[PDB]
Amino acid sequence: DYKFWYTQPVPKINDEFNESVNEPFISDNKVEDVRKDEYKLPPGYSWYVCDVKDEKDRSEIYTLLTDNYVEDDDNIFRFNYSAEFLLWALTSPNYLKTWHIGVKYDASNKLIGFISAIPTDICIHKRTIKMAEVNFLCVHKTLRSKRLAPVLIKEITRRINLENIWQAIYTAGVYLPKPVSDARYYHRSINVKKLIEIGFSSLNSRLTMSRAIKLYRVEDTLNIKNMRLMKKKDVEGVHKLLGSYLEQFNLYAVFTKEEIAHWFLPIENVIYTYVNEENGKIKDMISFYSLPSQILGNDKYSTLNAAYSFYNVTTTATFKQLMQDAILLAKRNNFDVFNALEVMQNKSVFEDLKFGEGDGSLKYYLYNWKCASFAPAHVGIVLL
Numbered sequence: 001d002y003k004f005w006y007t008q009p010v011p012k013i014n015d016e017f018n019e020s021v022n023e024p025f026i027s028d029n030k031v032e033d034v035r036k037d038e039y040k041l042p043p044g045y046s047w048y049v050c051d052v053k054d055e056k057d058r059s060e061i062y063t064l065l066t067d068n069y070v071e072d073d074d075n076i077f078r079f080n081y082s083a084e085f086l087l088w089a090l091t092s093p094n095y096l097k098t099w100h101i102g103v104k105y106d107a108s109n110k111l112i113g114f115i116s117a118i119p120t121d122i123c124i125h126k127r128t129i130k131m132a133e134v135n136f137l138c139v140h141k142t143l144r145s146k147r148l149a150p151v152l153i154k155e156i157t158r159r160i161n162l163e164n165i166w167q168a169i170y171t172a173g174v175y176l177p178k179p180v181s182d183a184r185y186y187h188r189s190i191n192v193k194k195l196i197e198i199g200f201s202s203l204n205s206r207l208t209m210s211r212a213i214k215l216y217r218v219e220d221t222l223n224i225k226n227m228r229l230m231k232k233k234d235v236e237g238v239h240k241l242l243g244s245y246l247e248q249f250n251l252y253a254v255f256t257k258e259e260i261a262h263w264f265l266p267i268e269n270v271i272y273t274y275v276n277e278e279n280g281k282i283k284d285m286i287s288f289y290s291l292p293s294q295i296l297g298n299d300k301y302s303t304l305n306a307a308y309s310f311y312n313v314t315t316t317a318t319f320k321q322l323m324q325d326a327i328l329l330a331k332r333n334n335f336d337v338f339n340a341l342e343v344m345q346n347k348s349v350f351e352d353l354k355f356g357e358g359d360g361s362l363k364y365y366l367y368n369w370k371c372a373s374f375a376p377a378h379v380g381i382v383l384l
């Protein structure tokens, strides 16, 4: 029935727009007319502005998400974004502290809800629009189905609109009105025995343990020999190589040089970017971020260490060769599995590089924007 969503400027479930339509649902917005009062919470609850740069505030967000954030459809894994990852994800160029919004239960002073956004220029069907990218919506497990999520969404919408920003981008596994694109995850096992043991992968009479280990074995030699960790000197180069690649897609972030430094410069256990420099030019790049899952009630392993593909571009090798190198670099950094969405060129390598299809998919959404939807190979943005 979507009783909340059908109040909002998003498409109905059966809306179909053709390529001649690429504009807002609601235009001519004025900051002057945005509500200046905070949305009302149920009695006993209060808004709290989180300071993500403060270690203690950040640890409170970390705890809320560790305990209550997204699980796989089978409730076997729960994402466990690290505190240093959250610091990176939320303090991008020009971020607003006041879009990092928490809800405390007053009687215990405990954070029980959170939602966040950061600002970025998004190009959709060649039109570039300032958007908020919304993420980390989370309601404590003990307070589910009480309609707190619409309150957090309406309050962040209000605060984003105060900055004269009227569109947003967000992804989710749940189906909501209405995806602009839909992309499955695929996974490439690295630490095969651990993935078996925790119930992530399986074996059969044809695929014995030893045969599975051999199937997923990787040669410890790079196809692109000079791939090395990115440094500050490489920011102009990555800005040109990635910037030029992305222009072909129907949906992508238009990164400034400051944004390139922020999103790609390596941070241990958070973001890994490797470059190939030839003649003072950056000609290939690989990048992947760290997102572990807590393995729910497992005796042996508490954590699945997963690398998620971010942005990969080659001009000196094949895409296959580049992605075989990304799996190698993730292996050299202790990751158990390399995951990727069927966006950009990724699906073209999945068969040959022995990826498995994951369950369900990730839906891409715009708020207050009507346009044609498209196949996920035309998506050129990866959100965290």
Ligand SMILES: C#CCCCCCCCCCCCC(=O)SCCNC(=O)CCNC(=O)[C@H](O)C(C)(C)COP(=O)(O)OP(=O)(O)OC[C@H]1O[C@@H](n2cnc3c(N)ncnc32)[C@H](O)[C@@H]1OP(=O)(O)O
Pocket (backbone or CB within 6 Å): 001, 002, 003, 004, 005, 006, 068, 069, 070, 071, 132, 134, 135, 136, 137, 138, 139, 140, 143, 144, 145, 146, 147, 148, 149, 150, 153, 156, 157, 160, 161, 165, 166, 167, 168, 170, 171, 172, 173, 174, 176, 367
């Ligand atoms: C400018 C501008 C606009 C700015 C705003 C743009 C819109 C942004 C939307 C939010 C985007 C979120 C992106 C993500 O971060 S992804 C990960 C979501 N994090 C989890 O998966 C963690 C585990 N899970 C939870 O923590 C809770 O289940 C949630 C997700 C907070 C939902 O809370 P609960 O207690 O279930 O549900 P209640 O409070 O009764 O709310 C029901 C209404 O809510 C809608 N809803 C549910 N999940 C949603 C969701 N994931 N995103 C958006 N809406 C969602 C839903 O359909 C329904 O509304 P209807 O009646 O159907 O029209």
Ligand SMILES: [Cl-]
Pocket (backbone or CB within 6 Å): none
């Ligand atoms: Cl009022």
Ligand SMILES: [Cl-]
Pocket (backbone or CB within 6 Å): 220, 221, 222, 225
């Ligand atoms: Cl090597």
Ligand SMILES: [Mg+2]
Pocket (backbone or CB within 6 Å): 139, 143, 144, 145, 146, 147, 148, 149
């Ligand atoms: Mg609720």
